[PDB]
Amino acid sequence: MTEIATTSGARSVGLLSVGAYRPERVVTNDEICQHIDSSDEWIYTRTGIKTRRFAADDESAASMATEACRRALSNAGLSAADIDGVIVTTNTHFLQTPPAAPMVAASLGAKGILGFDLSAGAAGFGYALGAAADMIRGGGAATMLVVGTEKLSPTIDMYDRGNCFIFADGAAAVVVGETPFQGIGPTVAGSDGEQADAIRQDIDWITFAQNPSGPRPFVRLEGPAVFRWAAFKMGDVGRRAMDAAGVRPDQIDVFVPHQANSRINELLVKNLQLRPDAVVANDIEHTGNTSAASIPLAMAELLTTGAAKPGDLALLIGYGAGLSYAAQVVRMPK
Amino acid sequence: MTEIATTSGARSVGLLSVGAYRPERVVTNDEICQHIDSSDEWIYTRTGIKTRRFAADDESAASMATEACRRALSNAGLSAADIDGVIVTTNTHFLQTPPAAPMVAASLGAKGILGFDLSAGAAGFGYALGAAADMIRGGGAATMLVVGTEKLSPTIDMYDRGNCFIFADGAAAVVVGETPFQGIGPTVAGSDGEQADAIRQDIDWITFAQNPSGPRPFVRLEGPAVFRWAAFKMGDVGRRAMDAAGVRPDQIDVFVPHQANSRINELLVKNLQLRPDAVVANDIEHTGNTSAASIPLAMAELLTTGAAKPGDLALLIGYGAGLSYAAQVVRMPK
Ligand SMILES: [Cl-]
Numbered sequence: 001m002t003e004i005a006t007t008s009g010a011r012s013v014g015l016l017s018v019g020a021y022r023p024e025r026v027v028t029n030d031e032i033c034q035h036i037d038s039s040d041e042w043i044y045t046r047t048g049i050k051t052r053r054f055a056a057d058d059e060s061a062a063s064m065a066t067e068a069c070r071r072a073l074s075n076a077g078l079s080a081a082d083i084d085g086v087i088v089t090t091n092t093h094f095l096q097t098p099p100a101a102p103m104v105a106a107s108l109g110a111k112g113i114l115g116f117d118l119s120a121g122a123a124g125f126g127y128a129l130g131a132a133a134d135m136i137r138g139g140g141a142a143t144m145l146v147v148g149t150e151k152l153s154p155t156i157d158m159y160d161r162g163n164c165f166i167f168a169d170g171a172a173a174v175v176v177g178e179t180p181f182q183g184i185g186p187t188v189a190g191s192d193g194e195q196a197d198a199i200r201q202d203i204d205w206i207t208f209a210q211n212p213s214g215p216r217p218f219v220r221l222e223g224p225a226v227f228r229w230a231a232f233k234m235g236d237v238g239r240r241a242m243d244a245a246g247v248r249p250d251q252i253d254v255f256v257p258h259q260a261n262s263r264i265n266e267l268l269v270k271n272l273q274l275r276p277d278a279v280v281a282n283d284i285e286h287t288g289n290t291s292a293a294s295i296p297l298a299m300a301e302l303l304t305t306g307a308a309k310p311g312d313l314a315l316l317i318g319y320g321a322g323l324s325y326a327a328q329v330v331r332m333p334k
Numbered sequence: 335m336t337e338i339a340t341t342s343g344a345r346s347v348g349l350l351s352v353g354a355y356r357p358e359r360v361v362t363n364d365e366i367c368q369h370i371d372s373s374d375e376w377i378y379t380r381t382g383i384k385t386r387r388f389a390a391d392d393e394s395a396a397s398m399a400t401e402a403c404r405r406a407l408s409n410a411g412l413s414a415a416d417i418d419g420v421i422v423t424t425n426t427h428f429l430q431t432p433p434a435a436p437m438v439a440a441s442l443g444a445k446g447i448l449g450f451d452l453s454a455g456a457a458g459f460g461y462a463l464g465a466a467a468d469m470i471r472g473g474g475a476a477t478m479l480v481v482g483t484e485k486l487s488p489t490i491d492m493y494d495r496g497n498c499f500i501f502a503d504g505a506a507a508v509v510v511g512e513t514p515f516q517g518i519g520p521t522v523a524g525s526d527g528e529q530a531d532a533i534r535q536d537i538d539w540i541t542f543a544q545n546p547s548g549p550r551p552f553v554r555l556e557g558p559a560v561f562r563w564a565a566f567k568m569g570d571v572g573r574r575a576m577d578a579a580g581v582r583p584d585q586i587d588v589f590v591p592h593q594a595n596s597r598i599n600e601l602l603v604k605n606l607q608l609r610p611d612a613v614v615a616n617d618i619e620h621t622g623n624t625s626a627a628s629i630p631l632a633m634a635e636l637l638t639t640g641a642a643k644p645g646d647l648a649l650l651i652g653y654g655a656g657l658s659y660a661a662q663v664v665r666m667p668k
Pocket residue numbers: 270271
């Protein structure tokens with residue numbers, strides 16, 4: 001008889017670049033406060049958000065992903081031909097099928113490359129990044145695109161005084177490939193499925209399709225439940241990720257938690273025992289909560305301002321719907 | 335520069351078991367023929383389908399996935415405590431969020447384990463299995479559940495003369511873990527995003543939500559286009575998968591293509607130059623096309639009839655929406 005072959009690729013993998021796409025339209029707190037009894041002062045104090053970007057009607061999660069990938073490729077000095085696969089992570093691709101990944105690949109001029117869509121709420125980026133790293137190390141690919149993208153705005157109920165000022169749109173991609181030294185730490189992930197209702201679409205699409213003249217679905221957020229969970233549990237997740245990467249808290253240069261709420265993230269900083277001079281992502285102020293796109297958007301922001309430098313040691317922690325979390329230590333890209 | 339650590343897992347990974355859930359309700363060709371001009375004879379001759387199963391109204395992709403996982407765990411002699419992660423592959427989770435994986439995990443009594451949803455049409459199982467193997471070999475997990483699940487019945491237009499008799503419901507799960515010998519070969523995958531319309535939801539959920547007085551969304555299949563692509567291209571994909579696994583066509587005991595159409599799979603059998611006595615999955619006769627669930631359901635069927643034996647060398651080829659494909663050689667589970 002015979003034995004199935006065992007193969008592998010390059011074990012040392014890193015981020016070669018990040019590229020970001022932020023839709024043109026700025027929406028201020030004042031504009032949001034047209035339909036709720038609140039204020040700019042209240043929203044900012046409670047969430048850290050001042051403005052956010054909304055995509056145009058002719059844009060989609062897929063279209064924004066493609067643009068982010070184009071920019072990541074340019075920032076890496078690479079072309080579509082250099083990519084072996086693409087993982088699209090999103091929760092706002094509004095078709096059951098086909099998946100966005102093949103269309104994104106085709107738009108980039110690499111229609112034939114492997115790829116799929118990964119959905120895990122905000123934790124989607126960490127899972128997709130870990131999955132790309134795993135695939136590359138295993139020899140299934142040499143270089144990959146991982147893109148987080150969300151068009152959340154069409155799912156927002158603008159009268160919902162719990163979340164209409166939270167969610168927003170955008171996309172950001174990383175090129176993942178072989179590096180001289182290890183650039184992506186082990187994935188630390190998990191969930192709490194018992195709190196699946198905390199971030200949800202309230203009416204499923206089929207129930208809706210069978211009663212379309214009735215209420216339509218919107219995203220709902222049980223804010224305090226998520227706040228409590230994230231603020232209390234993500235510190236341990238961070239410690240596990242640093243432990244797995246073999247780094248001490250005081251070695252982290254840059255902290256990039258999912259941009260859910262500034263107060264949650266501030267509490268995490270105070271729990272994580274980072275250096276006083278550690279750089280902390282605050283992209284939320286002008287980006288809001290872009291779920292799956294949040295972390296790569298925040299990474300791009302930090303590099304843009306120069307607050308983060310290429311090579312900086314970064315701790316990434318994604319947390320959100322499903323109650324799903326995913327974290328890893330990485331070295332900052334270009 | 336601070337160095338980043340790397341974990342390592344098992345070298346030899348395989349399918350420990352499969353578990354299958356087939357919904358109670360049997361739907362005959364004639365019962366489908368009620369809103370179209372066709373016959374049982376025609377459907378069977380053209381597609382290889384005699385009956386299919388429909389899930390009840392109180393069932394979902396997620397609920398079926400859970401039951402399939404329960405059975406897979408039983409068939410492996412394992413409990414939920416033995417599982418480190420779960421990947422749900424589906425294209426019919428009818429909520430943008432939360433993802434199904436955490437709720438499946440919670441239902442099984444392992445609310446905390448890592449997991450995510452992966453969408454790639456019919457190729458989803460191959461991608462998820464590949465990702466599970468990659469994660470385990472990478473040391474991110476030791477044992478995983480990979481479950482393909484589909485509730486397509488509510489997306490069927492009974493007046494669609496091209497596909498109303500094609501799609502169906504069901505779920506099947508595999509336990510993936512360390513094995514004495516190599517059980518999962520290298521992943522071979524790719525797509526054709528230029529043919530993204532071939533299998534699609536015709537109207538996106540948001541456009542639909544904004545126009546309730548218009549048509550509702552249904553799944554559409556450009557049958558001939560998919561037939562052509564699969565019949566002409568999947569042979570090469572199979573040969574690539576066998577080559578990567580270091581096995582010859584004449585060493586394959588079992589061929590498990592996606593159950594899209596019996597005549598496509600018959601053509602593939604001939605093209606692949608397999609042994610005269612090689613066994614070809616034909617679960618489609620009483621299952622129809624269950625997209626992501628199709629391959630593991632077919633595997634379970636072959637094991638049920640005894641056509642496949644545990645340990646048998648099997649070629650898997652998933653082909654479907656997005657135009658996505660994923661293939662690998664595996665050893666059959668229990
Ligand atoms: Cl604290």
